[PDB]
């Protein structure tokens, strides 16, 4: 239930998230675009600096007034085919180099930590105060800097499928934000889009997002969601921890199958006032796919000895999730002390470096970094026994993959629905049906993906914001309005792209999208969006 104090806690979390996103954007621009910095920063350094900045900023807010506050989502930097879960520690850089020596260079940016021109860099971070969570995620583009222009600018706009994915994600984000804002004043919903006297539904959300994705020739990655957020329940680990109640719309391989054939989440709800909504949309480009196929996810392991595929990425996930329902008294004193530190963090995913007493840095020092690494060695020693007794689990690294439909149809599964992954460590992904109508299990689909020679990895663009549907008493302006805690025109400004694809205006859904854009621009009689501003540091 929205209140002045609850809204203020959400607002402060959103402000800290916006400031952190501006910080990472400035760091990346200085390292790769401005080039004032002598040595370019790497991805683990950027993640660590972002986390330290967030902790330093959050130290001053709600101190000695709130039991639990901290980082909700660790800083994740995903490049191209990687659709989530990439937050490596600083002590795994040489590990990554040694594990990926002799592989292809398709994941060279992730392996070396150094960004390259043409990269789609997706930055995700979240902040919670008293369990009230605000999460932001922005795709940006890395460009070569033109040496001839007096001012710094890209030589040319980004072109191709990555540009299509960025455009689709940005336009879907804006349209969904406007559509969810329309729930407060339902009469302003366009007639071509849906019923004037009726509200916003998950069916309308899904058909709008699918229409935008199909227009821009992109698929929706099966991790996308437009869901409701409560205290401590923000989907911070959605594929790992089951939830009692779910109110939102999700996209899966089952939904892709149903669209082709045209506590379980269902799109049979009505958006209500006084609610907080997370919108996380991942769009994968389908430019290189000459036929109709299915978009799925591939989990990255750290074992180089499982295959001979030179186009494989070998890495260890850096974010862990504590399972508070599991208890086991450990044998190592280091492991027991680490578990005591872990239980202080709460119910959000955490990095091993977040548990260091040296972290966050008061002054950025080489000695501070070295003491952090010295802590991290014993932290890994304790984490080995913690993970062995199922007290904590890894947050997976996932690569988007494309599997054609003809290979799936020609394949034979002798088990049907009965097959499942017995070696899987987590319950929720281990027993899953990605293709319920075809009777294909997750293990069977992974086997098909590995068996096909024409299964490729699709570039992904991501946009994720948090919004509040503020009622008239809740809002300052005496009218219902949408408060965007994260994202907007100041932090998530789109990069220079040029996409040949476009929305086709001769469709009712596209006309409703254009009218939603018009009514969002209309600041007099239309809808009211209040963006949350990043704060100044000096």
């Amino acid at each position: 239930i929205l209140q002045e104090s609850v809204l203020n806690k959400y607002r402060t979390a959103g402000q800290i998230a916006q400031t952190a996103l501006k910080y990472v954007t400035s760091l990346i621009n200085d390292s790769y675009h401005s080039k004032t910095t002598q040595r370019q920063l790497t991805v683990p350094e950027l993640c660590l600096l972002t986390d330290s900045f967030i902790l330093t900023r959050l130290e001053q807010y709600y101190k000695n007034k709130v039991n639990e506050r901290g980082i909700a989502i660790p800083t994740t930097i995903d490049i191209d085919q990687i659709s989530g879960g990439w937050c490596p520690e600083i002590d795994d850089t040489q590990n990554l180099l040694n594990w990926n020596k002799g592989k292809d260079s398709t994941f060279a940016s992730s392996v070396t930590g150094t960004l390259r021109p043409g990269d789609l860099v997706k930055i995700t971070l979240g902040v919670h105060i008293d369990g009230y969570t605000s999460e932001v995620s922005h795709t940006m583009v890395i460009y070569p800097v033109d040496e001839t222009k007096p001012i710094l600018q890209p030589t040319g706009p980004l072109l191709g499928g990555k540009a299509d994915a960025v455009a689709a994600a940005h336009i879907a984000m804006e349209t969904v934000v406007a559509l969810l804002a329309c729930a407060l004043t339902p009469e302003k919903l366009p007639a071509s889009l849906g019923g004037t006297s009726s509200g916003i539904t998950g069916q309308l959300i899904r058909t709008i997002v699918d229409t935008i994705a199909r227009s821009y020739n992109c698929g929706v990655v099966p991790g996308s969601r437009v869901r409701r957020i409560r205290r401590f329940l923000a989907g911070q680990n959605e594929g790992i921890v089951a939830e009692r109640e779910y109110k939102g719309v999700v996209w899966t391989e089952s939904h892709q199958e149903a669209d082709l054939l045209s506590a379980i989440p269902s799109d049979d709800f009505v958006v209500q006032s006084g609610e907080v909504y997370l919108i996380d949309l991942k769009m994968a480009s389908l430019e290189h796919c000459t036929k109709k196929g299915l978009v799925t996810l591939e989990t990255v392991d750290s074992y180089t000895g499982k295959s001979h595929k030179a186009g494989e990425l070998i890495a260890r996930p850096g974010a862990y999730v504590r399972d508070f329902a599991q208890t086991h008294i450990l044998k190592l004193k280091t492991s027991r002390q680490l578990l005591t530190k872990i239980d202080k963090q709460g119910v959000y995913p955490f990095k091993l470096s977040h548990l260091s007493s040296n972290f966050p840095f008061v002054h950025e020092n080489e000695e501070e970094l070295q003491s952090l690494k010295k802590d991290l060695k014993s932290f890994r020693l304790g984490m080995s026994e913690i993970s062995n007794n199922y007290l904590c689990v890894e947050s997976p690294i996932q690569i988007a993959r494309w599997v054609p439909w003809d290979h799936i149809l020609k394949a034979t599964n002798p088990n049907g629905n009965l097959s499942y992954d017995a070696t899987s460590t987590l319950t929720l992904p281990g027993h899953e049906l990605p293709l319920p109508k075809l009777g294909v299990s997750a293990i069977k689909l992974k086997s098909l993906m590995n068996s096909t020679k024409e299964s490729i990895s699709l570039p992904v663009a991501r946009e994720c914001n948090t919004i509040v549907l503020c009622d008239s008493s809740v809002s300052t302006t005496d009218r219902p309005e949408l408060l965007r805690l994260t994202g907007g025109s100041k932090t998530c400004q789109p990069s220079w792209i040029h996409s040949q694809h476009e929305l086709n205006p001769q469709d009712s859904i596209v006309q409703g999208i254009f009218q939603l854009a018009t009514l969002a621009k209309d600041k007099r009689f239309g809808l009211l969006l209040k963006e949350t501003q990043p704060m100044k540091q000096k």
Binding site: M140, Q153, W405, L409, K437, G439, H498, S499, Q500, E502
Partner: peptide, 26 residues
């Protein structure tokens, strides 16, 4: 067979522009 009918239907169903941003680094 319902599975066979589903597979047959699947086989049947499978058988300017836009510009964002500008010449600047946000």
């Amino acid at each position: 067979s319902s599975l066979t009918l589903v597979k047959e239907a699947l086989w049947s169903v499978i058988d300017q522009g836009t510009t964002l941003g500008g010449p600047f680094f946000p």
